[PDB]
RNA sequence: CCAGGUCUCUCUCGUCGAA
RNA sequence: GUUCGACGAGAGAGA
């Protein structure tokens, strides 16, 4: 993705938007307890903790565009994937007005507590002026799509999270792009049949995570993988996307009934932004926050992994690989083992950088043991061979409890973090369990313990 | 005082409804 | 007491 133009908001006609400059993570009650590196990532340009300029270094993330046509691989691999896509055998109908916006089967409801994006952001409006969960009216919204209509520019955020030490000084924060309530709607209508499918199949069939529940679904994936595994990671993946990748998806999209809307992908890789005071254009990447967004990266993934592979292994039956995605994240299987060192290299000829799965400095084999996915390991259970725990490394379980946004939260932040924790056995459990009754308002909680965790989890496929 | 995207899953709270 | 459902708000994690 390639930034095409840039240049003050007051003369293209558009608001100079104004954003805070304060994080809302402050330390909290068990800052000093636990262990753990990561502090709240850079927001304004002043940053006392800042090694290089600011605002060069977080749209840096803008590569540069690689290809503009489809190639012969990418063509092959279209038909693949959207022929595998065929046999959900999903409804291609327009979702009428009132359902994207106010949920259906499939489909949760607009976000009532987050920007209407604009104009109603610089206009003074949230989205509860305009939307009501129980009246359910269309009408007022329908107003302000005849007014505004649709393709309207992104607003651009500063992500306010926690981050590694190297990325703060370094000023890799990350982007927000607000889509327009209108744009979100319009999306809605033309795909939220599309999202409901997606949502309803995760598995081998879609090669999509989304709509999946980590803690019941990890046991079915072992199963659904075949012999040998393969894996990698991206850098960037979002920004790094050629718009040719934007048209072959758009043929998938063509081949399985979705013709009329398939120019709504065009507002995509072709993008107006505003940030602050500037305004500019991009054109190839997938932006933030649009509907979809989640959906289409995953898409995306599955065509990248049978271009990539058609074209490093000459001659390969695509119908042997069963992948998910979820976004740019996947777990991946053959047969035979495949050599993600190989597709890295014929990769970056597609716009794409690959590196080792799990921050690792060489392709190594990808075994049941060393392999991850939504930063989760498989390790089956003791009593229970058959049923698989997703894992998550108490590391960062840690980095999450030494820092809140409102201590009134306190009990609900923790009691969550204890339903991650206990899958690393109960001697680490109760070990953490013990750090955070080692202070006051630690003892005053009230925690389950891994008896009561690990009961209803079983209970849960009863 | 507020400001800060799209989704997915889980948990907590509050409402009405259930022998 | 608790369970169960529907519907609203909060929060965590993952992409």
């Given at each position: 993705?390639?930034?095409?133009?840039?240049?003050?908001?007051?003369?293209?006609?558009?608001?100079?938007?104004?954003?805070?400059?304060?994080?809302?993570?402050?330390?909290?009650?068990?800052?000093?307890?636990?262990?753990?590196?990561?502090?709240?990532?850079?927001?304004?340009?002043?940053?006392?903790?800042?090694?290089?300029?600011?605002?060069?270094?977080?749209?840096?993330?803008?590569?540069?565009?690689?290809?503009?046509?489809?190639?012969?691989?990418?063509?092959?691999?279209?038909?693949h994937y959207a022929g595998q896509l065929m046999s959900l055998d999903i409804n291609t109908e327009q979702m009428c007005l009132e359902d994207a916006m106010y949920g259906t089967d499939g489909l949760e409801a607009l976000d009532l507590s987050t920007s209407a994006?604009?104009?109603?952001?610089?206009?003074?409006?949230?989205?509860?002026?305009?939307?009501?969960?129980?009246?359910?009216?269309?009408?007022?919204?329908?107003?302000?799509?005849?007014?505004?209509?649709?393709?309207?520019?992104?607003?651009?955020?500063?992500?306010?999270?926690?981050?590694?030490?190297?990325?703060?000084?370094?000023?890799?924060?990350?982007?927000?792009?607000?889509?327009?309530?209108?744009?979100?709607?319009?999306?809605?209508?033309?795909?939220?049949?599309?999202?409901?499918?997606?949502?309803?199949?995760?598995?081998?069939?879609?090669?999509?995570?989304?709509?999946?529940?980590?803690?019941?679904?990890?046991?079915?994936?072992?199963?659904?993988?075949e012999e040998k595994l393969f894996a990698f990671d991206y850098t960037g993946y979002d920004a790094s996307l050629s718009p040719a990748w934007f048209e072959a998806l758009k043929?998938?999209?063509?081949?399985?009934?979705?013709?009329?809307?398939?120019?709504?992908?065009?507002?995509?890789?072709?993008?107006?932004?505003?940030?602050?005071?500037?305004?500019?254009?991009?054109?190839?990447?997938?932006?933030?926050?649009?509907?979809?967004?989640?959906?289409?990266?995953?898409?995306?993934?599955?065509?990248?992994?049978?271009?990539?592979?058609?074209?490093?292994?000459?001659?390969?039956?695509?119908?042997?690989?069963?992948?998910?995605?979820?976004?740019?994240?996947?777990?991946?299987?053959?047969?035979?083992?495949?050599?993600?060192?190989?597709?890295?290299?014929?990769?970056?000829?597609?716009?794409?950088?690959?590196?080792?799965?799990?921050?690792?400095?060489?392709?190594?084999?990808?075994?049941?043991?060393?392999?991850?996915?939504?930063?989760?390991?498989?390790?089956?259970?003791?009593?229970?061979?058959?049923?698989?725990?997703?894992?998550?490394?108490?590391?960062?379980?840690?980095?999450?409890?030494?820092?809140?946004?409102?201590?009134?939260?306190?009990?609900?932040?923790?009691?969550?973090?204890?339903?991650?924790?206990?899958?690393?056995?109960?001697?680490?459990?109760?070990?953490?369990?013990?750090?955070?009754?080692?202070?006051?308002?630690?003892?005053?909680?009230?925690?389950?313990?891994?008896?009561?965790?690990?009961?209803?989890?079983?209970?849960?496929?009863?």
């Open positions: 993705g390639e930034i095409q133009w840039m240049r003050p908001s007051k003369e293209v006609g558009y608001p100079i938007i104004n954003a805070p400059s304060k994080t809302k993570l402050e330390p909290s009650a068990f800052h000093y307890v636990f262990e753990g590196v990561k502090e709240p990532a850079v927001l304004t340009k002043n940053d006392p903790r800042l090694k290089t300029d600011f605002e060069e270094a977080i749209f840096s993330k803008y590569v540069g565009n690689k290809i503009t046509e489809v190639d012969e691989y990418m063509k092959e691999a279209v038909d994006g604009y104009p109603y952001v610089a206009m003074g409006k949230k989205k509860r002026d305009i939307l009501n969960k129980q009246t359910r009216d269309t009408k007022e919204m329908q107003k302000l799509l005849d007014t505004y209509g649709i393709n309207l520019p992104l607003v651009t955020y500063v992500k306010d999270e926690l981050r590694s030490k190297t990325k703060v000084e370094q000023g890799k924060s990350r982007l927000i792009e607000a889509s327009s309530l209108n744009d979100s709607v319009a999306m809605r209508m033309a795909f939220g049949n599309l999202y409901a499918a997606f949502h309803k199949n995760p598995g081998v069939i879609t090669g999509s995570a989304v709509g999946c529940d980590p803690d019941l679904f990890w046991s079915k994936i072992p199963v659904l993988m043929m998938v999209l063509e081949k399985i009934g979705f013709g009329d809307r398939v120019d709504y992908i065009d507002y995509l890789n072709h993008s107006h932004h505003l940030y602050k005071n500037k305004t500019y254009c991009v054109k190839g990447g997938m932006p933030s926050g649009m509907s979809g967004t989640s959906i289409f990266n995953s898409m995306i993934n599955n065509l990248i992994i049978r271009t990539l592979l058609l074209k490093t292994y000459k001659g390969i039956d695509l119908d042997h690989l069963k992948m998910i995605a979820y976004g740019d994240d996947v777990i991946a299987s053959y047969p035979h083992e495949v050599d993600a060192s190989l597709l890295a290299q014929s990769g970056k000829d597609y716009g794409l950088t690959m590196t080792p799965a799990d921050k690792s400095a060489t392709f190594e084999t990808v075994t049941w043991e060393n392999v991850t996915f939504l930063k989760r390991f498989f390790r089956a259970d003791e009593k229970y061979p058959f049923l698989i725990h997703p894992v998550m490394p108490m590391k960062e379980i840690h980095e999450s409890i030494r820092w809140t946004k409102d201590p009134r939260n306190t009990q609900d932040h923790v009691r969550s973090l204890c339903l991650l924790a206990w899958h690393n056995g109960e001697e680490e459990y109760n070990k953490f369990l013990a750090k955070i009754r080692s202070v006051p308002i630690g003892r005053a909680l009230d925690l389950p313990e891994y008896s009561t965790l690990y009961r209803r989890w079983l209970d849960s496929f009863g």
